[PDB]
Write a protein that binds this ligand. Structure first.
Ligand SMILES: Nc1nc(O)c2nc(CNc3ccc(C(=O)O)cc3)cnc2[nH+]1
Length: 262
């Protein structure tokens, strides 16, 4: 498994771009692509994971473990106490995958410790733990991510709110930013400040699977049926072609079957 290292304590937008660029290049299937957009790989493809080491300020680091097939965060780890590696697996991880999060995050079986994420990765759960009806109320931003890392990295006890807040922010600035060019650009336009995720960034996150299927199944560039998304103002946004949603998409969820590759 490879790890993409990103210095959150000291960056520029070009470094952010390079980061996502490296995570996409690593996550994507070396050949799967529909309409010129890279597609994630089939679950049987190896490696099945990719790590993202987030280096905050004050020597506070957190490593994220992502599944390559759908870019989902399965858990995270942080340097703890002396030679310890504290892994936190999402509660929606099951079977062998739970051993995979533990061993892939903390290879040294001798010094690794467990600290379970007692809830799933679904936004409504994360939002509920963060104590917000919508993640739109939790601003995203570099300095913010850095600050959330510091509240967890090495700290024995943090609340589910503190934890959910870190997750919400990290999930969107990492995997959601990698999945969508639009989301990356939003972060870069507000690189030096805190910003609330707009209706389009959130909708994109919620309709990624549909968009990916729709584009995979697209005929000549025509979406099987009209896809109803929402723009930045929160207005209805009906897409009929791949050219209309493609600019905002960097990676497509793995969708089984052949497709118009270009
Ligand atoms: N990076 C990452 N990691 C995960 O573990 C993860 N899990 C999910 C499932 N849950 C959800 C819940 C709500 C919505 C939504 O409200 O749009 C979309 C997906 C989605 N997106 C995810 N992204």
């Amino acid at each position: 498994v490879n790890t993409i290292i990103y210095n959150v304590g000291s960056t520029t937008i070009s470094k952010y771009a390079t980061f996502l660029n490296d995570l996409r290049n690593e996550a994507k299937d070396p050949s799967l692509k529909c309409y010129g957009i890279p597609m994630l790989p089939n679950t049987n493809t190896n490696p099945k994971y990719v790590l993202v080491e987030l280096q905050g300020s004050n020597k506070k680091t957190i490593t994220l473990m992502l599944r390559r097939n759908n870019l989902y965060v399965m858990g995270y780890s942080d340097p703890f106490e002396t030679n310890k590696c504290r892994y936190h697996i999402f509660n929606d991880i099951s079977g062998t995958e739970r051993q995979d999060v533990e061993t892939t995050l903390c290879p040294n079986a001798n010094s690794r410790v467990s600290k379970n994420i007692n809830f799933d990765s679904r936004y409504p759960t994360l939002e509920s733990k963060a104590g917000v009806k919508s993640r739109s109320q939790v601003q995203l931003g570099i300095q913010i991510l850095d600050s959330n890392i510091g509240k967890i990295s090495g700290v024995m006890s943090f609340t589910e709110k503190t934890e959910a807040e870190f997750l919400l922010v990290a999930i969107q600035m990492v995997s959601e930013a990698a999945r969508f060019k639009y989301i990356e650009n939003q972060v870069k336009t507000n690189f030096n400040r805190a910003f609330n995720p707009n209706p389009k960034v959130l909708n994109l996150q919620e309709t990624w699977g549909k968009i990916s299927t729709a584009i995979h199944d697209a005929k000549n560039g025509v979406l099987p049926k009209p896809l109803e998304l929402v723009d930045a103002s929160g207005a209805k946004w009906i897409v009929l072609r791949v050219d209309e949603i493609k600019p905002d998409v960097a990676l497509l969820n793995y969708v089984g079957g052949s497709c118009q590759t270009t």
